[PDB]
């Protein structure tokens, strides 16, 4: 009839709760969708593993990791695009990759291209298996609802079996394959002369030569004489001098300990045999001193709703991803990763964006649960009611903190800028005039530096080299890691981070709390989770729904994450990364200008944005010209997004009316009447293009800058 049906078709494709009201069918559809996603992931992994076997310089890089740039993509010479095949070294031409796949393969003991082919074939087989399993479990043997609600058995298996046994199996693989092959590689042995991994298993004296403890067999494990296994199960700490990563023996010991702990932890919840706790009993019986009655009623809420569980899991996964991003740059786990700067910058930025998106999703699905599944009559919970009964106090206090933080974090920058402009450099907040030192962080750094030898007797070195007191590490003439100083410039940016995080939290929490009703629209629950407005009455009620709160919070998440990656990039380029001469003098890439230039807004515009963007804008005619082309294209998308965000719907409907008249004049009028986009759709289109343009611009800028220098 009209064109809005086409748009509505793709908008509700995965909303199973709207299609049917039966929990069993929703659960079955969710199971099959998960199977399909797993199949797609396996296909992606198969492609990645295959491409590195046929179209890569993996072997040449393996013979010389420092001086050869990794590559796994090659372009066809059709329209003159073969200029993208740069000289990456090793007698190979192609596109340099920054996903850190070569380091993973080297740390796993892979030495030839025959093993990658087998891995690719196995992954393809697994993808086919997952697709068939999804089809079978939806159409032939679909489980019942009572199967999905056995959350005591799901936790036991997902802790003991999935996580407990995976770590143990990986520790076994490491001990049996990764340690000896990496020891041979680190000894200067040519890769084609290293014995195959199965020779270590079949021939035992070969393993005994490298580690004498393997001659004793498995008897010391059973006799509790565990000190004999200290040859390959160490507690050293620090980085490997040869490669620049963590010792593989430490990783093996860590995985063994983690596996044992998870296996122990997986025997907690009660099952058919009557030993262990029940989750409902733990929730009900818990009554501390201020809760009073307790958490009575959360079991039904969390077992009869999919949106609450999705929100909780999304929040936890986002926080975990951010932690993973932070913990990998400071303690590099793979060989030849710290001194390869292109990959280090790319791995930190990827997971930050992923974590931010997942957190915003958690907020959105909490709002959806509040709008749809909330039921005070049948599923009453006390704590949620008390939180809903004083929501005015929560929001008003969170509103104040944002203003205070914003003033006391941005007015300092503005004051510095004004004092610099007026020729009064002695009145700025800097290391020379007025110092705001982060004393607590420095105390933490000193404590962590001094912890080995006093509070950690078994440790031979500190966990990381960022805490001041350690020694510089150099691999192949480049700087891998060294202590990171903290000063007045690091005091302001941390409070910028805090301010942005608090504002995002304010927006999302306000949306979630006022999803059901507010003082303006008492019946907002009946209008739905996703509705544009409630008319121009009461002065105007534009964007009152929770969907619009998530739409507003996406912008602030993007604003917050962008400052983090800029801070990381400039601080690492100016204070850590660099090169070392033969006599031991470190020359950083930008020569330590972060301390003095990063205290005014002019310093970020001139010393960071203007100075570091000269690489991308001069990439025309070289193998990096694709980054120069993507730099300009992303600006177009970002500026194109503004048409949907700034304008309304009536103007475009009238324009389409005139266009339809001109079409009717020539008997080319379609039977499907054209319609302008809805109010909600126009908002969704704008933010998508906005985020795409911004992220693509930053991506091209970073990748073109860091590969060249």
């Amino acid at each position: 009839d009209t064109t809005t049906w086409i748009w509505n078709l793709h908008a509700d494709a995965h909303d199973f709760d709207s299609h049917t009201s039966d929990l069993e069918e929703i659960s079955r559809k969710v199971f099959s969708a998960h199977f399909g996603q797993l199949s797609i992931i396996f296909l992606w992994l198969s492609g990645m593993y295959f491409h590195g076997a046929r179209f890569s310089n993996y072997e040449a890089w393996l013979s010389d990791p420092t001086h050869i740039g990794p590559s796994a993509q090659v372009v066809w010479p059709i329209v003159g695009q073969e200029i993208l095949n740069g000289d990456v070294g090793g007698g190979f031409r192609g596109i340099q990759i920054t996903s850190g796949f070569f380091q993973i393969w080297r740390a796993s003991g892979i030495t030839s291209e025959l093993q990658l082919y087998c891995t690719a074939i196995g992954a393809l087989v697994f993808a086919a298996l997952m697709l068939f399993a999804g089809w079978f479990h939806y159409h032939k043997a679909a489980p019942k609802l009572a199967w999905f609600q056995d959350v005591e058995s799901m936790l036991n298996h997902h802790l003991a079996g999935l996580l407990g046994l995976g770590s143990l199996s990986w520790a076994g693989h490491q001990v049996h394959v990764s340690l000896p092959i990496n020891q041979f590689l680190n000894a200067g042995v040519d890769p084609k002369e290293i014995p195959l991994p199965h020779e270590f298993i079949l021939n035992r004296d070969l393993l005994a030569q490298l580690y004498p403890s393997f001659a004793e067999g498995a008897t010391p494990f059973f006799t509790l004489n565990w000190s004999k296994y200290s040859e390959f199960l160490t507690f050293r700490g620090g980085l490997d001098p040869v490669t620049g990563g963590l010792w593989l023996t430490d990783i093996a010991h860590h995985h063994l300990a983690i596996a044992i702990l998870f296996l122990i932890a997986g025997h907690m919840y009660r099952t058919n045999w009557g030993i262990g706790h029940g989750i409902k009993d733990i929730l009900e019986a818990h009554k501390g001193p201020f809760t009073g009655q307790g958490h009575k009623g959360l079991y039904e809420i969390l077992t009869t709703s999919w949106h609450a569980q999705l929100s909780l899991n999304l929040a936890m996964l986002g926080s975990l991803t951010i932690i993973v991003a932070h913990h990998m740059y400071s303690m590099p786990p793979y060989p030849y990763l710290a001194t390869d700067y292109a990959t280090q910058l790319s791995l930190f930025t990827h997971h930050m964006w992923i974590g931010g998106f997942l957190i915003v999703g958690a907020a959105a699905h909490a709002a959806i649960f509040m709008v749809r599944d909330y039921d005070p009559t049948n599923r009453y919970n006390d704590l949620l009611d008390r939180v809903l009964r004083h929501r005015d106090a929560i929001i008003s206090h969170l509103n104040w903190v944002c203003i205070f933080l914003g003033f006391h974090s941005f007015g300092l920058y503005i004051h510095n800028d004004t004092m610099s402009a007026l020729g009064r450099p002695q009145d700025m907040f800097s290391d020379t005039a007025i110092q705001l030192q982060p004393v607590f962080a420095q105390w933490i750094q000193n404590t962590h530096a001094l912890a080995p030898g006093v509070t950690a007797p078994g440790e031979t070195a500190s966990t990381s080299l960022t805490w001041g007191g350690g020694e510089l590490v150099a691999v192949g003439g480049k700087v891998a890691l060294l202590p990171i100083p903290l000063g007045t410039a690091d005091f302001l940016v941390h409070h910028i981070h805090a301010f942005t995080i608090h504002v995002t939290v304010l927006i999302l929490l306000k949306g979630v709390l006022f999803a059901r009703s507010s003082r303006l629209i008492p019946d907002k629950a009946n209008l739905g989770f996703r509705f544009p407005c409630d008319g121009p009455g009461r002065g105007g009620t534009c964007q009152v729904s929770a969907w619009d709160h998530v739409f507003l919070g996406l912008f602030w998440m993007y604003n917050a994450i962008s400052v983090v990656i800029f801070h990381f990039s400039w601080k690492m380029q100016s204070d850590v990364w660099g090169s070392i001469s033969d006599q031991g003098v470190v020359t950083h890439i930008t020569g330590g200008n972060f301390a003095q230039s990063s205290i005014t807004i002019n310093g970020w515009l001139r010393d960071f944005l203007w100075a570091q963007a000269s690489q991308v804008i001069q990439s025309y005619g070289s193998s990096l010209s694709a980054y120069g082309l993507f730099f300009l294209g992303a600006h177009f998308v970002w500026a194109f997004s503004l048409m949907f965000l700034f304008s309304g719907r009536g103007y475009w409907q009238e324009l389409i009316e005139s266009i339809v008249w001109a079409h009717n004049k020539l008997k080319v009028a379609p039977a499907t009447q054209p319609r302008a986009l809805s109010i909600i759709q126009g908002r969704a289109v704008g933010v998508t293009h906005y985020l795409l343009g911004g992220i693509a611009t930053t991506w091209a800028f970073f990748l073109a800058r860091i590969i060249a220098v």
Partner: protein, 56 residues
């Protein structure tokens, strides 16, 4: 060789004492799962004691 050392006696006593504490078809309804759990707990306790004592 190993039989009769300190480790053997220590963990034998640990397991037996844990089983006796757990107990105090079968007259008392001691399910096989209970026996497995009590033996396991005795084993972790004994391993932790032996490893700690072996250091000093």
């Amino acid at each position: 060789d190993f039989i009769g050392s300190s480790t053997n006696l220590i963990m034998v006593t640990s397991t037996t004492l844990m089983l006796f504490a757990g107990r105090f078809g079968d007259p008392a309804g001691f399910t096989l799962a209970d026996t497995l759990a009590c033996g396991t707990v005795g084993h972790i306790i004994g391993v932790g004691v032996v490893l700690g004592l072996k250091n000093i």
